[PDB]
């Protein structure tokens, strides 16, 4: 209601809801607005709204984006925190021509600065990860700023509890994997998995079997493989052992991690040799996680297959995301203007793609009411030569019906992909079972 | 509400909603009113309403119709931009007795004038085409005016993006066919396909297989076939190569196209020889596109068949348009006063046409609520002698039901045509499947 | 019953039922056995059985395969006419290094010899065509032998009647296309379309629109296009005009065509110049008709598309033929050992191909009872690069159910093709609608 009058809207920043830059007309200043559609998840979402908004009203640190107001309109809600254009940090670093232990200590310092602040404020972030770490501006000396989300929480003093199972498999502490009570410490363990990538540019734990990754993360199995770690100050490796401590009660606090300066004093005393190889690996990992970290709705069994399969999965995925969100612009991009469907709504007929579907993204399901969580089971992929491929899978869809009751629906889908002009395009689409 | 009191309504101008001339009573002046029925497409439409209305509030150019207000009434909405009676341009030109390079340069100049204005205003038209090009009046020296629609958009400065797949197959730039980000340039490419028709009176690209037309349009395959292009100044051909540039970043801007005057200076320096043959071809093409450009809901496979088939398709089409719109006047015109149906609503009986159907165009589906997108598959046509013919097809119909949920329905239809008095008339009609 | 004891069976010759070589044990001699499965078409078939068997008991010509007996066993019937291994004639001719008017006259002579015999016997073949023309042996001086089928008939003396619409579109006389009574003449007209190919190596009539081909065939529109016909004796061209006569009553009889020897006397007097170009065209046409003449169950609209489409249609076709016949050997050849289905019998699951289907070709529908005529409508094909492709179509299937009543069933199918090792292979298969 009120954000309609005072503010003007401009380009999108990110998506998930949509982030967009705006500027206040009345006292002219830029901000960034979270547009949270009135369709979230009934209750579990609204709860996380007010939590995120409250936490951010409380968190005012020079290294953390601070909110301004949160306005509720008719078909939307708006959250206006502080704006930025900096790119990601793990993205800026690779662009650096001199990366040293001393640039990494400059990072973990600002990081631990945002963290300590809030840990003093009786709040734990729980989701700490490269994605969540960003750069104020691209302008020189821009600050690292912690990204407040959203699996976040308010602890009582130092009291440890069970706040439920949240965060990213690689960024998860053992106390949380053991299903034991936790607290501020589960944040320190992230930093430790973060520092380790902030040096050698690969993660301390990982496995394709996530059951195994977790075992490592519960067993504290990491090591400093030579040669790359040989050029690393033993102080660096010391902090890393203090954060990466299995027992949270023995785990170095955030306050303690600032005082011990393999960062502040190795800024004063550590190795600056530009490690170009680390930086490269880093960049590679980043691209991978961007494409691989695509979605947590993927169920199947493989063993390290052709990255071109992992790419064609990511695509199938990007398409189904457009479908649910009501995003038509993106739907036409990924589909051949000559695409042919076979679908239950077709009533048994074959169709030309760019005629039939318009209706649905127009007024059907496009941004209707409730989230329908989509599950994709046992996909299977055929690769025929360099430019073509086809993918067969079962999509199970959890939605709220008119009554408001939830239902499930399962449809068999085949999709057929042709790469023309470096871009994959959908050509045939074949859907079995019910209408989505 | 307010357009009811101030304005008086008169004859229709065009249709799609309906354009109509009116005059403001209070300060007496003529305008042209878009009557957009409250049934549009739920959301996707309303979005394009406010976009079109906003863009036109912003676009004030001497060569572009300017809006005045946009009024919302109960069962209708009204958009009042500037009025005209000029006929189409590609229509006026053929009527000209002297057409030269210098009349064509006089056109592309005014054109590029409307375009440049808006390109400066951070807006791209995306649909540029003869239809969209009109003449203020039939009065001497009347101005060309760009027709603002509606696949239109607001770019940020010069930033290129993916705005989704829109426009007419012949008028589509390659950057859009390649599914790459685009911007203002996709407008310049249209002008180039426009100039080329504005000289020789046939288009640079075309094929019946639209997959092929697009390949040409992606490959920039056009050439200047002799003799007709032999009498054309090499400056003319120069601009044409600058607009028709495949790479948008290398593509001549609109600002650049005005300064280079194969138009302004060839107005001063170019060929005036009245090319009568070009003008004729032009006129022919026009009629064809008017009849052929009928609708984008046609699916089938043919090879350049008797134009009398292409005419009898256009008709079947004109009829089904009347049906959906609720247009009865037009329905009686195309139907024999002695027409006989066989239809599901007939409950198994044969009927006399002008009794039964009245009910439906009276209160049934006539202008009910929501758009039902009609698809016509694999039509098949029998031609028996000069005056008769019959057409068999499957019509699939996408609508919103009472619940508001979308459904599909497929009906088999046969229609039988008799030409009496130069006009085709429906005589028998046979519908299978469900009631529409 | 009796063919079980006396005869031994060996390799297949052809298929349609199956032809196979055998040898009589008791008086040792080779023959060729038609194995007509007890599933034919109820009555319409059994009628053509006894007709074919009767006609062949009657037709004993040195140039026509003569039957010996026709034995009825439990689950099969056997027809034993005379055996051959000669290859096809239009196939042998191309292999010839000297082809002249005099070799062609040597052919049409033997041909007219088999024809005249039977025309004297009150029987008309009605299906005359390259396929039906074969070579006794590959041994020197092997004889041309007419292949007795099967759209055949017994006329009374010279009385003309309506024997119904049969034969091949190109090989059809006008009196039959006009739907007028006919007789022996409809055989002479074939020879005339045959001679014409027996010289220049392309047919007199043809069009892709079969409505048009028939118009030519009803209008007698053929001409002798220069240069290739320039080197042809005017006698040759004379016979051709006598056979290719529109009015059957004016049409040269078979008896008359033997006496006029542009064949026997031009054997004595005509052009022998080896026409290598004609022979080449011939061979090409042959391959085309073999692949194109595949089946008469194909419905759609195209215009002369990439021969690689015409090839991938022929394949889809070859596969569906294997399915219906119960031919598993052929089914595994055309299918990837890693093929994945999605099918109604799958009960909503994705399967590995070479596990699931065995059951069906084992005891399900494999050679069950009755013919199920398969119709394939509006196929549509996507070509992605050289090695891959996918085809979407609606297959309608006319069968006899348990009751013996006929039913129809329509299924939507997508098939996906990968060429590996010069051979196309099926990889994914997706079937919608009911179980076949
Ligand atoms: C709920 O909070 C979240 C918000 C955000 N999103 C952003 C916020 C906030 N908030 C603030 N500022 C951002 C600035 C951005 O940079 C501009 C990028 C345009 N460039 C144009 C030129 N080309 C060459 C490069 C790209 C940006 O995009 C990367 C995202 C931003 C995210 Cl990503 C996640 C969560 Cl969880
Ligand atoms: C959404 O905007 C659009 C609006 C319009 N429509 C028009 C606007 C507007 N706006 C303004 N002025 C028009 C003047 C016209 O000329 C009068 C024709 C009557 N003549 C009577 C005498 N006889 C011999 C010849 C015909 C006219 O009809 C051809 C259409 C007009 C269109 Cl076509 C498309 C879009 Cl997308
Ligand atoms: C209902 O009557 C019909 C019967 C037949 N079928 C045949 C009859 C009969 N009858 C007699 N003799 C045949 C001899 C054949 O040649 C042997 C080919 C094996 N070669 C092995 C070596 N490699 C290199 C080449 C192939 C043959 O196959 C082409 C088919 C034959 C037909 Cl095609 C159609 C109808 Cl309508």
Curated annotation (Swiss-Prot), chains A, B, C:
The record places the active site at: 127
Q: What is its EC number?
A: 2.7.11.17
Which reaction is catalysed here?
L-seryl-[protein] + ATP = O-phospho-L-seryl-[protein] + ADP + H(+); L-threonyl-[protein] + ATP = O-phospho-L-threonyl-[protein] + ADP + H(+)
Keyword Cell membrane (UniProt): no
The annotated consequence of residue 278 to P reads: No effect on neuronal migration
* Compartment(s) of residence: Synapse; Postsynaptic density; Cell projection, Dendritic spine; Cell projection, Dendrite
Q: Which residues cross the membrane?
A: none
Which cofactor(s) are needed, names only? Mg(2+)
**Anything known on activity regulation?**
Activated by Ca(2+)/calmodulin. Binding of calmodulin results in conformational change that relieves intrasteric autoinhibition and allows autophosphorylation of Thr-278 which turns the kinase in a constitutively active form and confers to the kinase a Ca(2+)-independent activity.
Q: Which residues carry this modification: Phosphothreonine?
A: 278
Q: List the GO terms this entry assigns under cellular component, sorted alphabetically.
A: calcium- and calmodulin-dependent protein kinase complex; cytoplasm; cytosol; dendritic spine; endocytic vesicle membrane; mitochondrion; neuron projection; nucleoplasm
- Modifications made to the protein after synthesis: Autophosphorylation of Thr-278 following activation by Ca(2+)/calmodulin. Phosphorylation of Thr-278 locks the kinase into an activated state. Palmitoylated. Probably palmitoylated by ZDHHC3 and ZDHHC7.
- Impact of mutating residue 278 to D? Loss of neuronal migration
Region (Calmodulin-binding), start-end ranges = 282-292
Q: Which UniProt keywords apply?
A: ATP-binding, Calmodulin-binding, Cell projection, Disease variant, Intellectual disability, Kinase, Lipoprotein, Magnesium, Metal-binding, Nucleotide-binding, Palmitate, Phosphoprotein, Serine/threonine-protein kinase, Synapse, Transferase
What are the Phosphoserine sites (modified residues) in this protein? 249, 366
Q: What does this protein do?
A: Calcium/calmodulin-dependent protein kinase that functions autonomously after Ca(2+)/calmodulin-binding and autophosphorylation, and is involved in various processes, such as synaptic plasticity, neurotransmitter release and long-term potentiation. Member of the NMDAR signaling complex in excitatory synapses, it regulates NMDAR-dependent potentiation of the AMPAR and therefore excitatory synaptic transmission. Regulates dendritic spine development. Also regulates the migration of developing neurons. Phosphorylates the transcription factor FOXO3 to activate its transcriptional activity.
Q: Which disease is it linked to?
A: Intellectual developmental disorder, autosomal dominant 53: A disorder characterized by significantly below average general intellectual functioning associated with impairments in adaptive behavior and manifested during the developmental period. Intellectual developmental disorder, autosomal recessive 63: A disorder characterized by significantly below average general intellectual functioning associated with impairments in adaptive behavior and manifested during the developmental period. MRT63 patients manifest global developmental delay, severe intellectual disability, and seizures.
Q: Please describe the quaternary structure of this protein.
A: There are 4 genes encoding calcium/calmodulin-dependent protein kinase type II chains: CAMK2A, CAMK2B, CAMK2G and CAMK2D. The corresponding proteins assemble into homo- or heteromultimeric holoenzymes composed of 12 subunits with two hexameric rings stacked one on top of the other. Interacts with BAALC. Interacts with MPDZ. Interacts with SYN1. Interacts with CAMK2N2. Interacts with SYNGAP1. Interacts with SYNPO2. Interacts with SHANK3. Interacts with GRIN2B. Interacts with CACNB2. Interacts with LRRC7. Interacts with GRM5.
This protein's name:
Calcium/calmodulin-dependent protein kinase type II subunit alpha
């Amino acid at each position: 209601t009120r954000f309609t009058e005072e503010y003007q809207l401009f380009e999108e920043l990110g998506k998930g809801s949509v982030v967009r830059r705006c500027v206040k007309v009345l006292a002219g200043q830029e901000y960034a607005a979270m547009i949270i559609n009135t369709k979230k998840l009934s209750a579990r979402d609204h709860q996380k709204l007010e939590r995120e908004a409250r936490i951010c009203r409380l968190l005012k640190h020079p290294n953390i984006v601070r909110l301004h107001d949160s306005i509720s309109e008719e078909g939307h809600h708006y959250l206006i925190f502080d704006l930025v254009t900096g790119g990601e940090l793990f993205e800026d670093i690779v662009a650096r021509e001199y990366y040293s232990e001393a640039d990494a200590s400059h990072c973990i310092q600002q990081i631990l600065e945002a963290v300590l602040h809030c840990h003093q404020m009786g709040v734990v972030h729980r989701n700490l990860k490269p994605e969540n770490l960003l750069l104020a501006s691209k302008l020189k000396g821009a600050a690292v700023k912690l990204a407040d989300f959203g699996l976040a929480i308010e602890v009582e003093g130092e009291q440890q509890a069970w706040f439920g199972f949240a965060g990213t498999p690689g960024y998860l502490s053992p106390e949380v994997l053991r299903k034991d009570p936790y607290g501020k410490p589960v944040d320190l363990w992230a930093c430790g998995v973060i520092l380790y990538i902030l040096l050698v540019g690969y993660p301390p734990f990982w496995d394709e079997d996530q059951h195994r990754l977790y075992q490592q993360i519960k067993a504290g199995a990491y090591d400093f493989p030579s040669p790359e770690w040989d050029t690393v100050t033993p102080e660096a490796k010391d902090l890393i052992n203090k954060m990466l401590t299995i027992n949270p009660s023995k785990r170095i606090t955030a306050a303690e991690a600032l005082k011990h300066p393999w960062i502040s004093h190795r800024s004063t005393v550590a190795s600056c040799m530009h490690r170009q190889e680390t930086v490269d690996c880093l960049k590679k990992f980043n691209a991978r996680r961007k494409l691989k970290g695509a979605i947590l709705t993927v169920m199947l069994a493989t063993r390290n297959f052709s990255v071109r399969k992992q790419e064609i999965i990511k695509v199938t995925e990007q398409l189904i995301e457009a479908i649910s969100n009501g995003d038509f612009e993106s739907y036409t991009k990924m589909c051949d203007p000559g695409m042919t469907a076979f679908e239950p709504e077709a009533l048994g007929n074959l169709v030309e793609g760019l005629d039939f579907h318009r209706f649905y993204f127009e007024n059907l399901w496009s941004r209707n009411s409730k989230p329908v969580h989509t599950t994709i089971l046992n996909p299977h992929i055929h690769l025929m030569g360099d430019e073509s491929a086809c993918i067969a899978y079962i999509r199970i869809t959890q939605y709220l019906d008119a009554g408001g009751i939830p239902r499930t629906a399962q449809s068999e889908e085949t999709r057929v992909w042709h790469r023309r002009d470096g871009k994959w395009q959908i050509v045939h689409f074949h859907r079995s079972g019910a209408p989505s």
